[PDB]
Amino acid sequence: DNLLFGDEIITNGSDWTPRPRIGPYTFVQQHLMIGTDPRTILKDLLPETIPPPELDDMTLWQIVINILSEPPKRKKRKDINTIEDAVKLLQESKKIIVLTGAGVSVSSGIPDFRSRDGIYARLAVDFPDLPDPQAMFDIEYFRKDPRPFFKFAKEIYPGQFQPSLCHKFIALSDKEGKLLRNYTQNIDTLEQVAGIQRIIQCHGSFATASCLICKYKVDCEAVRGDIFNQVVPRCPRCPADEPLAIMKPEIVFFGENLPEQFHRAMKYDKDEVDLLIVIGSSLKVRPVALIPSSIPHEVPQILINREPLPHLHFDVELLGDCDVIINELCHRLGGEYAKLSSNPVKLSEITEQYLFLPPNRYIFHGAEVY
């Protein structure tokens, strides 16, 4: 048996008497002594996801210590509630961090390579070894067989997509010099195309490719040929006999470290930002999902997503399609913001109207709290 009773609270850095407190290392120590399966604790902390089987037990434990060590979630600031408050913030603020996800590329026409009915349908049909869409970006599977990734690559390649209202909005805030940084999890490289200057591409992009062995870098235009013919692009230097000599695009696959430029940028912007805005991301993947909990709690946070975030407390929640909400905010902002679109032939048949659900919530078109 073990020393722990299960009611302990694990601290990092009716209940009328204090519960015992353990460190995450002490906790995991105990569970090692019992020899409990880490997958269990992992399923208790994260019930909605299964760790890939190629994970050694010790790694899983390291992941558990990680999870247990994560910062305290932010208490919603009751000063800030309304969309009015929100625009007042977007005007007064001087060092704004914008955290984006696929929601800023919805209007751009990029297929859902994250859903199970998108490209994943035909790909799964062709490669039945693929468990789920995310495996398309699993580094171990890629090593094993990069075919599905490149059968898929040409579908989302950086040559044929146009920026959204959101991109343009962010780029404009950058011109005006209010944008401290735009952290994006997108790999579509549209942030650049829209002319945002201070971007950090947290999960990489198709901008370059690099051999798996010798780290030989090339431009996206060097590999574009092989990719559009659906041929796995090989390395120039590496001997042909070597099979893993593949030009892998520099997007952060699952199980890979994020670029050091990211961690640097976060350590800097950590104590400078005066407004955080999450746009078009539900924040499911770590460590990026940790960012809102990582900045000073007094900094106001604003959410612009299709769905609320259960695991996170924002001051103002605008729930709906991103471009719609952004458009609304533009109209309230005036100036170059109101002037901001070149594709409003599709925003003229989408409701301008929203419904306010006190004190925080606003429901726009394209929202789904299903």
Binding site: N66, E256, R286
Partner: peptide
Amino acid sequence: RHKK
């Protein structure tokens, strides 16, 4: 320790 901070892998994606």
